[PDB]
Amino acid sequence: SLMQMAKTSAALAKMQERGLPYISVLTDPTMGGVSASFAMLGDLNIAEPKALIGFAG
Amino acid sequence: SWIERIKSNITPTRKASIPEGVWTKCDSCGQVLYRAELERNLEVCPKCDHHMRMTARNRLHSLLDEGSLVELGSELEPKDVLKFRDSKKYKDRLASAQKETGEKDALVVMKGTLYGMPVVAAAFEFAFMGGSMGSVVGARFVRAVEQALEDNCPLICFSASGGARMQEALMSLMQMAKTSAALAKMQERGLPYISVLTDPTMGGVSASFAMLGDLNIAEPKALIGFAGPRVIEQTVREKLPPGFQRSEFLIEKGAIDMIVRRPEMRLKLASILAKLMNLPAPNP
Amino acid sequence: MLDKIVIANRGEIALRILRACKELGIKTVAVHSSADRDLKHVLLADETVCIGPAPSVKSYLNIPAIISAAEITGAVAIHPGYGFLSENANFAEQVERSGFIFIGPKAETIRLMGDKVSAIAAMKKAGVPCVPGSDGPLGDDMDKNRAIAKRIGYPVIIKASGGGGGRGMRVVRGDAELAQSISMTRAEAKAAFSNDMVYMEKYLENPRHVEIQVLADGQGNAIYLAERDCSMQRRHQKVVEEAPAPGITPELRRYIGERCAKACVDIGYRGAGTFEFLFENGEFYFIEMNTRIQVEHPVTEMITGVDLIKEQLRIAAGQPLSIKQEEVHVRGHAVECRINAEDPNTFLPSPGKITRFHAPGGFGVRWESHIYAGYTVPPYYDSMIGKLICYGENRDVAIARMKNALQELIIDGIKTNVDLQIRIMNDENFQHGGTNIHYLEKKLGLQEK
Amino acid sequence: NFLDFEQPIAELEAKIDSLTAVSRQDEKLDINIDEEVHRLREKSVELTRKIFADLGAWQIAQLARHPQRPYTLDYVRLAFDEFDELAGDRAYADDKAIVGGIARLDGRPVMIIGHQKGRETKEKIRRNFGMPAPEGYRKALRLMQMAERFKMPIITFIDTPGAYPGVGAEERGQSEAIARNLREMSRLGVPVVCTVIGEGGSGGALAIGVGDKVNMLQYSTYSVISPEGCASILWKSADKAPLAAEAMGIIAPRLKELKLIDSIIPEPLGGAHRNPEAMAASLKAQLLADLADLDVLSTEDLKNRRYQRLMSYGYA
Amino acid sequence: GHIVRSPMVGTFYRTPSPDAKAFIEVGQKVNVGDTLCIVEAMKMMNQIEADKSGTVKAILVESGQPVEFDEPLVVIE
Ligand SMILES: CC(=O)SCCNC(=O)CCNC(=O)[C@H](O)C(C)(C)COP(=O)(O)OP(=O)(O)OC[C@H]1O[C@@H](n2cnc3c(N)ncnc32)[C@H](O)[C@@H]1OP(=O)(O)O
Ligand SMILES: Nc1ncnc2c1ncn2[C@@H]1O[C@H](COP(=O)(O)OP(=O)(O)O)[C@@H](O)[C@H]1O
Ligand SMILES: *C(=O)CCCC[C@@H]1SC[C@@H]2NC(=O)N[C@@H]21
Ligand SMILES: [Mg+2]
Ligand SMILES: [Zn+2]
């Protein structure tokens, strides 16, 4: 599952040089690996109020 | 009984004539030194290892190999066009600095060679009205960048400026953008550029190309920032942190890459440029 | 003639220079520290100047302070003596350019000869024999080092070329520690003499320390005095000298003196210097040159009648050599036994206050020291507190006079090395004459169960 | 300073070391040192072989975090040369938990990035026990970009307990920095080789570990979460950590057989701390061999191959 | 009280220029940070700074007379 972070990062890099946007929205909660793979890597970082966002609990 | 003898005063007056140009002083430590010795030690006080002022052409001579110094863009000279009216006329300070330092502007350009590897170099003469960046400075920097692009070789600039030349107004400020454009042009090509921060580097030059190269090499106990410490003192009306804006402090705060002393500087620059250009290391 | 000079030293040699200056009619300038404000020569001088606090670095190694003192007093020359700034080439250059006269070799020769590898190379260039060896500082290749060592022959020794003072050198027995020993010797040389250059030379096991004092005015004149012999060394530092040496027939004496004079002529030497050697079965091996007034200078004055400091003061004044080769006559023998305030056995310095002092006196006894009743020995400098000579007609007479003087000599209040001197005198091999350099260490022995 | 299960070896080494000093200790003792030293060394070697014949995932973890072990600086000194340390993140600070720089290897300049822990307690405090703050990851990004620019190979090391879970790290976009690292490193035009010297993992260490090749030491662990954390979460108890380590398979053979790495680098007998020089020699040989074949590939084909290997990740 | 002593050895002066005013005056008190005299060495006129504030009790030196290390120059109460 950890390598899936790199796989999604590669997909994002592929589509980002093409010019197609990608807007990741942070719900309640967004923690752990997903928070640092594509949740916090899109063109926009839109959070929903009173949500727990980070890397470690 | 010489065992119990008092100390009489030395002769009140004797005519002694030491040559005048063989002793200096270091306010940092206080140890009087031999001028020729200090000049042979790359302007470093050997006792407390506190660096001092150095002529820009002297710095170029120290770095570049002898028998290869080639000045570039030497025809440019201050051509004032604003006619500023300060307490003194700007022409007064321009002429005074020009006749004192014996150089046309703050920046001095010399294409040289380093350990068999061609290289361009440049340096700021701080005595030229605080080494301010004029239009000649930016144009000469662009000329060096063009020489590097047409003749593939790293470019090195040593920053020493009290700030942007006020008497040239906004024109010197645009030179920051011009040099930034030159750096961007040569950075996508792949030719490195290592800016070294001397004592001191403040004002506009600090934020134009001094703090924009591939490396940020500072020299110890140098004052580096954007606004002078007096301005910050009058702004926050408080006390600066100990060792404020010192290379030791600014490498702690991550804005400075490495701290290199002047005697090691030539070998260190040669090694770093040889590695980055992927060239064979120089033989020592 | 130098109208007024500066005693750029302290202690015994300072007093000796002061006496020589007052003999020649040259006025005196005394430069001292704040701790040594009751030195004998300081009290026996017209002008006393204090140029720093107790530590050596701030007071006597303060070249700007010495030059300031020489400027305020109006001197036209400075005498360094031995130790401190004796061999500081930069000191000579600054004094030459400051407007005064350096009593000693020109700074160029100081640079060429003080560095041991350069001195050996120059000696080989002049034909003077030298120890076979690396003839250059070696790198980080152990194969090259062991190949050179096998070429010259084990055992081998690493010595700091800018080193001196009985330190900064390590002996290597085998390749199992050669690289580590070289690296740590380089580190010690960095920590002591501000130079990392270390070289390899052939190591001998049975040497005889033979050194020849020479003089030259730098104007095509070079004369050599009699030899010396310091076979009794401790930690590579001399404790009992003697001159001339046993077994060195006048044929060999003239043979090596002519070579040393030719070397001085070729180098263009000036001042008082000595060419050290190593003696074995008729072979001499130059290892170093001391371009200064050597501490064991008296054992050459008394056997020749020529005052070395007077020679230096005349040469520095520009006068040509007043003594020719045939006008030097070797008549006698001598012994010298330094006196130090260290611990007799543990070799720990024992500073303090002296309570009772009494010179030997007598025919042929010459007591060089500044200590006196109530003189407080400072815990800040070298442990030497005096030299002692007993000039005789042969070696046995000199040894007997030294024994009598040591019986007479009394120093109380602090620890002294007189007992070791008595033991050395009583030794049969020592009285015979011709012991090896390590003889002292063999007599030292080792640990016990 | 030794672990719990190293007591038979520990006692004998308190006697072997003295014999060198006893050769000239006191009382004129110069006993027949050579044969006794050789016999004691034989006994110690046999005991060490017998002890480390039996190995456990916990023992694997303990050896991975033995408080004597070559860090990134040790491997750089004892396997590389002409190392010039570059610091600074350009943004806020230069966190000590990551050490990066540029060095030459067999005449070819390389970029070396890896975590460093520290030997003494003071150094361990200064380096935060190898826990990188986000600014360190930004510095690693900058160094990787610089190496990418001048056609330079990149070789990185992974020895860190985990990304620092501090207040400042979370305040300064920890996840954002790690994501930014993980995006750019999939676009580099130069080969990336990584090693799992010491103990590394926790996901955060992957910000400098996504490349064409991955290698592991014989006594190293590479887990998604720390075994103690895994125990305290799943088993509801910290003391069941060895059971969690056994279940996970953090040991080197388990991670090798899962086709996640390339090869296991062997260690000198007694682990790496007994003979760090032989370990450095093995690591140098392995990295040179790995770098040899990879340099053939062209940059476009290299990136395409990396992308295909990126797709190869995961069971599905 | 406290007496200032020159840390160097050289020619002594009181006016920084051949024709000027002395740095301090007897009587009128002086502070911790102030220059009191000049002890020139090698034609490099250096300044002498006290360390304690108080009234100038007396001046124990005269212009043009060389002094040395640990030489009481001016006493401050
Ligand atoms: C807004 C700008 O970019 S220019 C504003 C001025 N600079 C700054 O605010 C940044 C730093 N400020 C400073 O005062 C200095 O540069 C400091 C803090 C490094 C102090 O260095 P100092 O040793 O005090 O040097 P100093 O300021 O005296 O510079 C020497 C000379 O250069 C002159 N100078 C320096 N910078 C400038 C400038 N930008 N324009 C005009 N003259 C300048 C000074 O007027 C001075 O001339 P003077 O000695 O004949 O009176
Ligand atoms: N090559 C050598 N072989 C044997 N002994 C030596 C050698 N070199 C030096 N020594 C010993 O060390 C003493 C001092 O050597 P020297 O080079 O004069 O060092 P220093 O500069 O410390 O006086 C010599 O008198 C000798 O006893
Ligand atoms: C150097 O050539 C002599 C000048 C030294 C200082 C001068 S001479 C006396 C004047 N008064 C004073 O305090 N210093 C002035
Ligand atoms: Mg010697
Ligand atoms: Zn200084």
Q: Is B153 annotated as belonging to a binding site? A: no
Do residue B25 and residue E44 have CB atoms under 8 angstroms apart? Answer: yes
CB D295 within 8 A of CB D301: no
Q: Are residues C90 and C159 in the same domain?
A: no
CA C203, CA C287: separation in Å to the nearest integer?
11
Residue B68 and residue B112 in contact, taking contact as beta carbons nearer than 8 Å: yes
Q: Which residue of E has its CA nearest to C49?
A: E68
Residue E13 C-alpha to ligand 5 middle, in angstroms? 25
- In terms of CA atoms, which chain D residue is nearest residue C447? D28
Q: Do B191 and B152 contact (CB within 8 A), yes or no?
A: yes
Cβ–ligand 2 distance for C288 under 6 Å, the answer yes
Both tokens assigned to C152: 């010259």
Is B48 annotated in a binding site? The answer is yes
Helix (H, G, I), strand (E, B) or coil at A33: helix
The closest of D176, D195, D189 to D138, measured between CA atoms, is D176
Q: Are B33 and B47 in contact (CB under 8 A)?
A: yes
Rg of chain C (C-alpha set): 22
Under 8 Å between Cβ of C171 and C157: yes
Residue B115 identity (one-letter amino acid): Y
**Rounded to the nearest 5 degrees, what angle is found at the Cα of D126, between the Cα atoms of D124 and D132?**
85
Q: Is the sign of the CA dihedral B203, B207, B213, B219 positive or negative?
A: positive
Residue C449 lies in a domain: no
What's the number of domains chain C is made of?
3
Show residues of chain A in contact with D178, CB under 8 Å: 36, 55
Does E72 contact chain B (CB < 8 Å)?
no
Tell which one of C287, C289, C296, C441 to mutate to probe ligand 2, the residue whose CB is within 8 A of the most ligand atoms: C287
Are D48 and D270 in contact by the 8 Å Cβ rule? The answer is yes
Beta bridge partners of C94: none
* C-alpha closest to that of C10 among C31, C28, C25: C31
Please give the distance of CA B20 from its chain centroid, rounded to a whole number: 27
Q: Using a 6 Å cutoff on CB, does residue C74 contact ligand 2? A: no
Instruction: Single out the residue of C132, C129, C114, C131 nearest to residue C256, CA to CA.
Output: C129
Q: CA-to-CA distance for B5 and D97, rounded, in angstroms? A: 67
Cβ neighbours of C449 in D, within 8 Å: 27-29
Within this chain, do residues C114 and C4 fall inside the same structural domain, yes or no?
no
Domain membership flag for residue C18: yes
C345: domain CATH number is: 3.30.470.20
In the reported structure, the alpha carbon of residue C268 is separated from the centroid of ligand 4 by a whole-number distance in angstroms of 21
Do the Cβ atoms of A1 and A24 come closer than 8 Å? Answer: no
d(CA C225, CA D118): 63
C-beta atoms surrounding E74 within 10 Å? 21
Long-range contacts of residues D239-248, Cβ cutoff 8 Å, at least 24 apart = D241/D58, D242/D56, D242/D57, D242/D58, D245/D57, D245/D58, D245/D60, D245/D61, D245/D221, D246/D56, D246/D57, D246/D58, D248/D57, D248/D223
Please tell me whether B26 is known to bind a ligand. yes
H helices of C7-88, in order, are 12-24, 40-43, 56-59, 63-73
Decide: helix, strand or coil at residue C175: helix
CA distances, D17 to each of B74, B169, D24, D41, D139 (Å):
70, 74, 13, 10, 43
Contact flag C50-E10 (C-beta cutoff 8 Å):
no
CATH of the domain at C164: 3.30.1490.20
Q: Are C90 and C143 members of one domain? A: no
Tokens of B62: 């120290």
- Answer yes or no: are the C-beta atoms of D85 and D101 closer than 8 Å: yes
Q: Is the peptide bond before B192 cis (omega within 30 degrees of 0)?
A: no
Number of residues in chain E: 77
**Contact A/B (≥3 CB pairs under 8 Å):** no
What is the spatial distance between Cα B161 and Cα B129, in angstroms, rounded to a whole number?
A: 9
The number of CA neighbours under 13 Å toward the Cβ of B241 is: 7
Relative to beta strand B193-201, strand B215-218 is parallel
Q: Chain B partners of D92 at a C-beta cutoff of 8 Å?
A: 253-254
Cα atoms in the Cβ-side hemisphere of radius 13 Å centred on D267: 23
Resolution in A for the shown PDB structure? Answer: 4.0
SS (H, E, C) chain D: CCCCCCHHHHHHHHHHHHHHHHCCCCCCCCCCHHHHHHHHHHHHHHHHHHHHHCCCHHHHHHHHCCCCCCCHHHHHHHHCEEEEECCCCCCCCCCCCEEEEEEEECCEEEEEEEECCCCCHHHHHHCHHHCCCHHHHHHHHHHHHHHHHCCCCEEEECCCCCCCCCHHHHHCCHHHHHHHHHHHCCCCCCCEEEECCCCEECCHHHHHCCCCEEEEECCCCEECCCHHHHHHHHHCCCCCHHHHHHHHCCCHHHHHHCCCCCCEECCCCCCCCCCHHHHHHHHHHHHHHHHHHHCCCCHHHHHHHHHHHHHCCCCC
**B119 touches B162 (CB < 8 A):** no
Do C77 and C96 have their domain in common?
Answer: no
- Mark yes or no for CB contact C67/B18 under 8 Å: yes
Residues 6+ apart with CB under 8 A from C439: C231, C232, C429, C430
Number of CB atoms found within 10 A of residue D81's CB:
12
Q: Which candidate, C67, C59, C69, C57, places its Cα nearest to that of C90?
A: C67
Residue positions of C in the annotated binding site for Mg(2+)? 276, 288, 290
Tokens 């580096």 sit at which residue?
B224
Q: Which of C146, C171, C203 is the last residue of a domain?
A: C203
Burial of C19 (0-12, 13-18, 19+ CB in 10 A): middle
CA gap C222, E5 in Å, rounded: 50
* Interface contact C90-B18, CB threshold 8 A: no
B169: its two tokens: 């107004």
Residues of E with Cβ-Cβ distance to B32 under 8 angstroms: 41-42, 44
C272 CA to centre of ligand 4 in angstroms: 15
CB E40 within 8 A of CB E11: yes
Amino acid at C73: T
HEC assignment per residue over B180-219: HHHHHHHHHHCCCEEEEEEEEECHHHHHHHHCCCCEEEEC
A29 cis-preceded (ω within 30 degrees of 0): yes
Dihedral in degrees, nearest 10, Cα atoms E68, E69, E75, E77: 170
Terminal Cα-to-Cα distance of chain B (whole angstroms): 64
Residue-level length of chain D: 316
Whole-angstrom Cα distance, residue B199 to residue B246? 10
Q: Can you give the CATH number for the domain in which C46 is found?
A: 3.40.50.20
Task: Answer whether B203 contacts ligand 1 (Cβ < 6 A).
Answer: yes
Six token digits for residue B190:
């792949």
Query: Which ligand is the nearest neighbour of the Cα of B244?
Result: 1
Query: For C50, which of E11, E42, E68 is closest by C-beta distance?
Result: E68
Q: Do C75 and C108 belong to one domain?
A: no
Number of residues that make up chain B:
284
* Residue C41 distance to chain B (closest CA, Å): 10
Task: Identify the helix (H) or strand (E) that includes residue C395.
Answer: helix C395-408
Residue C173 domain flag: yes
Residue by residue, what is the 3-state secondary structure of B233-247? HHHHCCCCCCCCCEH
CA distance D44 to D47: 5
Half-sphere exposure of D113 (CA within 13 A, CB side): 27
Q: Has residue C239 been placed in a domain?
A: yes
Nearest CA in chain D to A30: D175
Asked, for residue C436, whether it belongs to a domain, the answer is: yes
DSSP SS3 for C148: helix
Tell me how far the alpha carbon of residue A9 is from its chain's centroid. 9
Beta-bridged to residue C274, according to DSSP, are C213, C290
> Are residues C71 and B18, on separate chains, in Cβ contact within 8 Å?
yes
One-letter amino acid at C361 equals G
In this structure, the residue with its CA closest to atom 7 of ligand 3 is: E18
Asked if D83 is an interface residue toward chain B (Cβ–Cβ < 8 A), one would say no
Instruction: Render chain B in DSSP notation, one character per residue.
Output: -TTS---PPPPS-------GGG-B--TTT---B-HHHHHHTTSB-TTT--B----HHHHHHHHSPTT--EE-STT------S--BSSSBHHHHHHHHHHHH-SSSSEEEEEEEETTEEEEEEEE-TTTTTT---HHHHHHHHHHHHHHHHTT--EEEEEEESS--GGGTHHHHHHHHHHHHHHHHHHHHT--EEEEEEEEE-HHHIIIIIT-SSEEEE-TT-BBSSS-HHHHHHHH-SPPPTTTTBHHHHHHTTS--EE--HHHHHHHHHHHHHHHTTPPPPP-
Residue C32 structural domain? 1-85
Protein residue with least CA distance to atom 1, ligand 3: E43
Q: Token pair of C200, please?
A: 């390899």
Radius of gyration of chain E (CA): 12
Which of C10, C292, C366, C401 is flagged as catalytic? C292
Longest CA pairwise span in chain A (Å): 35
**Cβ(C368) – ligand 2 distance below 6 Å:** no
- Report the 3 state secondary structure along D37-59: HHHHHHHHHHHHHHHHHCCCHHH
One domain for residues C197 and C122: no
Domain finish residue from C85, C101, C121: C85
Contacts of D203 in chain A (CB under 8 A): 2, 5, 33, 36
For residues C23 and C310, what is the distance between their CA atoms, to the nearest angstrom? Answer: 9
Q: Which helix (H) or strand (E) holds E21?
A: none
Q: Give the separation between CA E37 and CA D265, rounded to whole angstroms.
A: 74
Q: Which of D183, D203, D311 shows the shortest C-beta gap to A12?
A: D183
Q: What count of other Cβ atoms lies within 10 Å of the Cβ of residue B118?
A: 15
Nearest to A29 by CA among A5, A53, A48: A53
Q: How far is the CA of C116 from the centre of ligand 4 (A)?
A: 10
Ligand 1 mutation pick, B105, B132, B233, max ligand atoms within 8 A of CB: B132
Q: Give the nearest partner residue to B18 out of E42, E46, E64, using CB atoms.
A: E42
- Measured from the CA of B93, which atom of ligand 1 is nearest? 50
- Is C434's C-beta closer than 6 angstroms to any atom of ligand 2? no
Q: How far is the CA of C276 from the centre of ligand 4 (A)?
A: 7
Q: Do C449 and D24 touch (CB under 8 A)?
A: no
Which three-class secondary structure state does DSSP give residue E57? Answer: strand
Pair (C342, C315) in one structural domain: yes
Alpha carbon distance B214, B191 (integer Å): 10
Domain co-membership, C114 together with C219 = yes
CA torsion through residues C269, C271, C276, C282, sign: positive
Q: What angle do CA C336, C337, C341 make, to 5 degrees?
A: 145
D174 to chain A: nearest residue by CA?
A55
Chain-centroid distance of CA C157 in Å reads 22
Nearest residue on chain D to A16, judged by CA atoms? D183
Q: Which DSSP letter does residue C135 get? A: E
B232: Cβ contacts below 8 Å, ≥ 6 apart: B240
The residue of D164, D182, D315 whose CB has the most chain A CBs within 10 angstroms, and thus the best one to mutate to test that interface, is D182
The coordinates were experimentally obtained by: cryo-EM
Kindly give, in sequence order, each residue whose CB lies less than 8 Å from that of residue D315, ignoring residues fewer than 6 positions away: none
Q: B125 — phi, psi (to 5°)? A: -85, 105
**Tokens representing residue D294 in the block:** 């990879």
Provide the 3-class DSSP secondary structure of residue C396.
Answer: helix
Task: Output phi, psi for D100, to 5 deg.
Answer: -130, 160
Of the ligands numbered here, which is closest to the C-alpha atom of C239? 2
Tokens of E3: 């007496």
Task: Clarify whether C331 is annotated catalytic.
Answer: no
- Inter-residue contact D224 to D201 (CB < 8 Å): yes
Same domain, C234 and C320: yes
Q: How far is the CA of E18 from the centre of ligand 3 (A)?
A: 5
Residue E70 backbone dihedrals phi, psi, to 5 degrees: 60, 35
Q: Point out the ligand 2 atom lying closest to the alpha carbon of residue C276.
A: 18
C167, C277, C278, C382: which to mutate for ligand 2, most atoms within 8 A of CB? C278
List Cα–Cα distances, D65 to D177, D193, D198, in angstroms. Answer: 27, 22, 7
Whether C357 and C244 map to the same domain: the answer is yes
Q: Are residues C56 and C21 in the same domain?
A: yes
What residue in D sits closest to C445 (Cα-Cα)? D28
Distance in angstroms between the alpha carbons of the first and the last residue of chain C: 64
The verdict on a CB contact (< 8 Å) between A41 and D206 is no
Q: Give Dmax over CA atoms of chain E in angstroms.
A: 32
Domain check: are C308 and C321 in the same one? yes
Q: What distance in Å separates the CA atoms of residue A39 and residue A55, rounded to the nearest whole number?
A: 11
Give backbone dihedrals phi and psi of B156, rounded to 5 degrees, phi first. -125, 130
C70 SS3 class: helix
Q: Give the nearest ligand 2 atom to C165 CA.
A: 22
Of C153, C169, C203, the position where a domain reaches its end is C203
Q: Which chains touch D (3 or more CB pairs under 8 A)?
A: A, B, C
Q: C209 pairs with which residues across the strands?
A: C278
d(CA D244, CA C120) in angstroms, rounded, equals 71
Give DSSP secondary structure letters for C276-321: EEEEETTEE-B--EE-S--TT-HHHHTTT---HHHHHHHHHTTPPP
> Which residue's CA is the closest to the ligand 1 atom numbered 28?
B130
Taken in order D241, D243, D249, D252, the sign of the CA dihedral is: positive
Write out residues with Cβ below 6 Å of ligand 3.
E 13-15, 18, 63
Q: Which residues pair with D98 in a beta bridge?
A: D115
